[PDB]
Subunit: 324 residues, 4 copies
């Protein structure tokens, strides 16, 4: 439910997926010569390869978030109550919602290139199957340049926003998310100067009183504000393992523990998995609620010119290293 | 920095330790026949065994948090600016702050019995050499109940802890009172008694947590962790319990960069310890290695007389999946 | 600024005006036969009478807030950084922003009528004079039905929204204001049931812990959320004096004391005046920062068929009632 | 429910009184030779004159807030659930809670005087009469030096605190009120500097986003924080009428409107009256919920050598000035 683009040296793209129902997700590599059959676009027999997290149904990857081999990344996040899809129209490039990640990563390589080519796009109301109605999504798109954009189809059509904070959660519309950001302009990671009650000595009784109003709620605006802050103040100039460890810490600070986000009677949205994808090197790191150890899958260990989905387990059991 | 007692079925006692300076911590078992040289109390050559996280100086275990073989846990958290120690007094049991954890765990079994035996105690200003840091303590046991032990300018206090958690400043009664400020928080959606007769755009799940504290400061972590701990799953086996415990503490984790205690110097979560009181096992991980390790105290010669030390801080232990070793 | 429509029995429309400098506002009655010379619309030599707070420039009322004799009210509030006006166009009915309140109150009777007639409207970039550039505004329109609308011209054009909370402040765009209200759905005036830490007895050490996260800042969102709450929970079924009294207290809940809203180097926005207009009776009640005693001007005690502005002072000195004067009269 | 000491030039001492029911309060001058019968202290047949707001019962002024002719002020505020009174004892000077304001103003002139002479005081559990059991109170005391103390009798006995912010509300204990102030140390009247997300240009869409976390609730803590802020930033170097005007506005910023503070089924705590007492001049200014016009009673226009209470009406009907 929280997606970030983290640029300490290399560039890392990933997300927490928080929900109360699973969708058979696995780690799925789609090689260069798997044939995408799009609903209303020309089928691509050869295309960029990609690795990400996906459900697989009737030999089709239904990606939740992924990156391709040229350093482009796309994540889809619930947009329930905000999104609107539109019927196929005879003068636009019609991408169905479930195939947006596939189509973008198969075809383009940079955010700037995605921007120039979404100008004719319509996100259509086409669903994958009758027993799989399209879900309401909006998308974060980042690349190796450290810049990202937000893609939102709503009542007023398709919108592409520049994303100055390289993060995204759920509702409301993206310009309202950014507006809300300014309500926390006074937050600081250390201690503020006392211009609150000038001339009075306040006992600064705790460290980091400058974050006393930083949101810790499980709702979409709270996670958006906190993760923007965590991401902006995270370390830079780190090697691979340090950068990947920091990426998980960032997303861990807005994780949803079971019991805190109630969505029905004893039904809870919680952080099902976290994914971390190196854009330069094509490596997908991940963990999940039940297993905190970080696993990794490298796209280049496989034959990118093959033509079948390569599939690994996402959800794992707790992998405790016993010491004595 | 954040310590909890979690009672889903078994009982788990542990803490995040958040700071900017490390103190050579390690896992440390103290067996029954290690000789405790107490600064102003009788030497204890035979005592309960215990396991925790500690620094070892001059062959002495300086514990941050630990449990003993009877199922009593004690954790020490920073109390800077709030605590006061006092000179050794003629009429009281004088425990030095740096040895409070060792003494309480070597001597007692239940939190109830720690309460009875604290009434004549004075926490002294004696240091190790290394001056004594300002701490207060959370004490908990297998009854699922816990106490707060604070020495401040008004003397030694012991408080029943109704939320089984503790962070840093201010004094514990103020922490508890501040909780009532969050009485409207719920994990789901509230009923709209805010603007009766108006249909609110409930645009997000869990709008009931919109005012839940997420700051890195001491009151914010206390309010969040109490809520996380109170709403965590119950009636669960060992591994699931341990998994939920670590998630509770991760929700009040301090990521590098968010808590600035100096010029480009940051307080962050250095390690997370989780200790099963029934089974004497210490699970832990640290900032650089997210994989949980375990040490079982009962798989050692608890009759020995030397300290058994293991490593705490480990490198990231990644599990590479598509190694193509084709075994 | 904060504007509200309040409906205990009669219907009361009005606002706080919060700012750092005054514009010569007075109480101004525009009678039925004052000739409105609009910028790109036909003049209206006969029209509804209206009373409100306005600046007078070249014998022209420049209303900040007013009501007309038929019980319609319009208030203009700062929309700086969100509003946009558009060049005059032939495909549309062009109303300049400085004349929106005058034109609507001269011409229309009800919020419904206003809605129907805004469907072809353009808020133009025309200014009263080359030397009085047009400020950025949005408007609250309410009437005796107890319903109101919000009128906003922004980047994407003109918009008219039903206002379910009968209040308005400044930025952001009105849909975003309503969204932000949901962030406070847990607020109650009394004490909440403890679903926070079930099983823990939390001492409710203060009354009204349910309002502990109610916003008190001077910013636009804070004042919007607080005044919506104040207005929703205010008493009903009151008679005249009682209703006016509660109206002023509602707007008082979000007033700006000097010193708390710094808008420039030692420059402060503060509540300059508060206006309360009975839609049914044509009576304008007011006080101001320096005088808390309420004053009243009845439109209907005046000759409404005439054609010159009838003008009364708005800002007054503090009007203190000295009790033990011992004039022993 | 909120009391302040305001020091723009002269010194002003006063309070909002918020509650759900009135106790027949009036403006009451007690002249120098009205005889006080104290429960456990010698009668004072002559003493300082005082003016304030009081319930009168059996020809006794039961003050809620008042000032004396030497420029000392005391205000009693509800302390329910925190305060404790103790049985009369021989070892101490026993002041009953209902008489605390009268005894202090009759006997002393400065806050320093009060501080010294409280070192042997017990606030007793004695009640004024069987029909009026003692309510739980704590007190703000201020004088013409511009400084104030807080007097609190709780579980651990009597406490006197210097008050750095010259304000007081209800629970919790005063050192906890002070500690909570530091949680708002980043609040500013204007725009903060963006140390929140460095490198990002936040759109500052509203004036005064620095007050976005200033409390506006009706609870005791919220009103305390906001009134400290209003009082700290209020104008200075003003003459009489401007100072009174700002004094009422300071207290209006934490006014309790009917409907916002529910204390039972359709029972509301609201701001019943506001008093503003000039310490130098002995003038009591007031208004009330039903009448926003300010009224004034001047102590020094009465014969302060008399011995009967001089009473004036406090609650008044809305006094509207009809212009035409
Ligand atoms: C519920 C969850 C988002 C909650 C957060 O915000 C985080 C979303 C994110 C990605 C979604 C899947 C995308 C691929 C197809 C598309 C098809 O249209 C429906 C099935 C499927 C698998 C989607 C299911 C579900 O909607 C997913 C997992
Ligand atoms: C997160 C937080 O509260 C920081 C606490 C941290 C700085 C404390 C916690 C335990 C302390 C050590 C206990 C043992 C010993 C005691 C001695 O008096 C000083 C030296 C030791 C190692 C303490 C150091 C430090 O204050 C520790 C780690
Ligand atoms: C509290 C707040 O929102 C401030 C609003 C305030 C500064 C506005 C509100 C009405 C404006 C006047 C309308 C009439 C006229 C219009 C003309 O374009 C410019 C001059 C006038 C007097 C406006 C001045 C100012 O923007 C006013 C008062
Ligand atoms: C806003 C707030 O804190 C409410 C306080 C309010 C209800 C208190 C304040 C002063 C109290 C009276 C003092 C005099 C007398 C004392 C006696 O023990 C009981 C009766 C009196 C009149 C008190 C009533 C009430 O508690 C008052 C008004
Ligand atoms: Ni006279």
């Amino acid at each position: 439910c929280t997606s970030i683009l983290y640029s300490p040296k290399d560039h890392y793209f990933g997300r927490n997926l928080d929900y109360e129902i699973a969708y058979g997700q696995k780690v799925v590599i789609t090689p260069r010569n798997y044939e995408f059959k799009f609903a209303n676009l020309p089928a691509e027999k050869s295309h960029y390869a990609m690795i990400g997290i996906a459900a697989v149904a009737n030999n089709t990857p239904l990606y939740c978030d992924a990156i391709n081999e040229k350093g482009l990344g796309v994540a889809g996040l619930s947009f329930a109550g905000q999104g609107k899809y539109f019927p196929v129209v005879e003068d636009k490039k019609n991408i169905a919602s479930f195939e947006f990640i596939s189509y973008i990563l198969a075809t383009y390589e940079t955010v700037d290139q995605v921007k120039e080519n979404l100008t004719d796009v319509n996100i259509s109301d086409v669903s994958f199957s009758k027993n799989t109605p399209a879900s309401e999504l909006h998308w974060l798109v980042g690349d190796k340049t450290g810049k990202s954009i937000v893609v939102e189809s709503d009542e007023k059509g398709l919108h592409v926003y520049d994303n100055p904070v390289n993060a995204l959660t759920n509702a409301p519309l993206f310009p309202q998310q950014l507006t809300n950001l300014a309500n926390y302009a006074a937050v600081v990671p250390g201690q503020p100067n006392n211009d609150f009650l000038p001339g009075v000595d306040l006992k600064m009784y705790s460290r980091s009183l400058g974050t006393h109003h930083l949101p810790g709620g499980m709702d979409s605006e709270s996670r958006f504000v906190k993760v923007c802050f965590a991401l902006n103040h995270a370390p830079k100039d780190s090697d691979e393992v340090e950068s990947v460890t920091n990426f998980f810490h960032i997303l861990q600070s807005v994780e949803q523990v079971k019991g805190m986000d109630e969505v029905g009677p004893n039904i809870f949205e919680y952080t099902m998995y976290t994914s971390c994808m190196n854009l330069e090197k094509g490596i997908l790191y991940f963990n999940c609620y039940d297993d905190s150890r970080i696993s990794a899958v490298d796209m280049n260990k496989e034959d990118l010119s093959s033509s079948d989905l390569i599939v690994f387990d996402l959800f794992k059991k707790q992998d405790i290293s016993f010491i004595n």
